[PDB]
């Protein structure tokens, strides 16, 4: 079967399994990735003259 | 989430919430 979700969510292994592939791909520390993922902060996708 | 219902009379509310 399959289930279609309203909003996407990450795959736990690619975050918790040290070293975090996602974080090193993004060049960002895992702590921030966790904080944004569980909706504790905002991150800037795009900023120009800002 | 939780639904908010609004009526005019308090007595009637207490009875509805039940």
């Amino acid at each position: 079967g399959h289930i279609e979700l309203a909003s996407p969510t990450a795959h736990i292994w690619f975050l918790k399994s040290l070293p975090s592939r996602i974080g090193l791909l993004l060049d960002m520390p895992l702590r921030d990735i966790e904080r944004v993922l569980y909706f504790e902060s905002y991150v800037v996708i795009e900023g120009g003259m800002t | 989430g939780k639904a908010l219902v609004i009526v005019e009379s308090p007595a009637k509310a207490k009875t509805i919430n039940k």
């Binding site: - | 908010l4 219902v5 609004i6 009637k12």
Partner: protein, 100 residues
């Protein structure tokens, strides 16, 4: 003084009753917890207007509001209330504004 302008297409100036500050304030904080707000005032034009005022004092988006009418206290009624609901009627609301 009147709070309505007969010479400017009946623009009005409504304002919370000097004795309902608390009442209105509690709804504003409680509104965030509620997902969908159900206005369940009387079906007549006065009740319809109270619903209209609540919706404009609590703010939010139209879709966040629903109109339900309770037949009786019996469960055979409080149930059907959320079964086949609807939204507030403008014509009814404007009829009450005209009288007022």
């Amino acid at each position: 003084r009147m709070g309505v302008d007969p010479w400017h297409n009946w623009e009005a100036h409504y304002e919370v009753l000097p004795g309902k500050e608390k009442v209105v304030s509690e709804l504003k904080q409680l509104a965030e917890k509620a997902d969908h707000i159900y206005l369940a005032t009387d079906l007549d034009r006065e009740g319809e207007a109270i619903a209209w005022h609540l919706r404009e004092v609590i703010g939010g988006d139209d879709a966040r509001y629903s109109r339900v009418v309770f037949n009786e206290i019996t469960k055979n009624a409080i149930r059907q209330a959320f079964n086949k609901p609807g939204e507030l009627n403008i014509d009814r609301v404007n009829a009450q504004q005209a009288r007022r």
